[PDB]
């Protein structure tokens, strides 16, 4: 997270760290959407042009964390994956269209002050809150500049108009994505970066005070460049797939 600040304890208790086993390393962020399902970006798990293709036993998730590196005993929970599901029409060849994946934990996790699921939006919540100029929040342990933080980082960023997102890049943007970040004329800065991919872009509903995961950190060109924006998987647009995976289990 570029130009963000330290999260408070328990500020993002749905935050999940995706960790590679061998070698040990933070791969991506992710989020807890129930006691046994974790959402992340498909590209964190599958990206053939970089020879990336993880299987369940290659990975762990760490839930409840604040420190990037310290083992947080009695606070964090380390879970194994039973199954990974990647959107069948995830487009890794072209533009990361439908950049979304679900991971089922081998056993449900107990909730706590530090571990708690985020909501997914319904139709009304998406229609109401996903509007240009309204802000959401991105969190992660990714790079501080395009340099790793000691603890989880947070920054709030505005949703940007689709034509401005499209003007900003030659990559083909689809309705399964949205972009966010400040414009060059707004003075303020801030973006997700390498290592934050897969983590949540959330909004606190003004109608019911619940936090909803509206986006997943998906792609960007550099981090925090003037005239460039972060791009996010549009969770609500892909919700029927999410529900199909969860239901059918």
């Amino acid at each position: 997270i570029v130009e963000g600040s330290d999260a408070e304890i328990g500020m993002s208790p749905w935050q999940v760290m995706l960790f590679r086993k061998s070698p040990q390393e933070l791969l991506c962020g992710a989020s807890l959407i129930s006691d046994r399902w974790v959402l992340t970006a498909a590209h964190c798990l599958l990206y053939p042009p970089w020879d990336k293709n993880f299987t369940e036993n290659d990975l762990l998730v760490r839930i409840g964390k604040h420190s990037r590196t310290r083992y947080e005993r009695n606070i964090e929970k380390i879970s194994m994956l039973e199954k990974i599901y990647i959107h069948p029409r995830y487009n890794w060849r072209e533009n990361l269209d439908r950049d979304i994946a679900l991971m089922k934990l081998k056993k449900p996790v107990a909730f706590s002050d530090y571990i708690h699921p985020v909501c997914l939006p319904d139709r009304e919540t998406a229609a109401s809150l996903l509007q240009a100029g309204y802000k959401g929040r991105v969190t992660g342990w990714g790079n501080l500049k395009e340099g790793q933080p000691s603890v989880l980082q947070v920054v709030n960023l505005p949703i940007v108009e689709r034509p401005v997102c499209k003007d900003s890049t030659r990559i083909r943007i689809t309705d399964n994505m949205f972009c966010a970040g400040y414009k060059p004329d707004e003075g303020k800065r801030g973006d997700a970066c390498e290592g934050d991919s897969g983590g949540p872009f959330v909004m606190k509903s003004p109608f019911n005070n619940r936090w909803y995961q509206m986006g997943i950190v998906s792609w960007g060109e550099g981090c925090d460049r003037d005239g460039k924006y972060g791009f996010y998987t549009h969770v609500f647009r892909l919700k029927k797939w999410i529900q199909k995976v969860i239901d059918q289990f």
Partner: peptide, 27 residues
């Protein structure tokens, strides 16, 4: 059922240091 309400924040009627920025962005 209880999704999206944080134990150390909404459940304790406490607010975090920057959520006001999100609320104001709605108006």
């Amino acid at each position: 059922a209880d999704c999206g309400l944080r134990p150390l924040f909404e459940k304790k009627s406490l607010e975090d240091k920057t959520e006001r920025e999100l609320l104001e962005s709605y108006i």
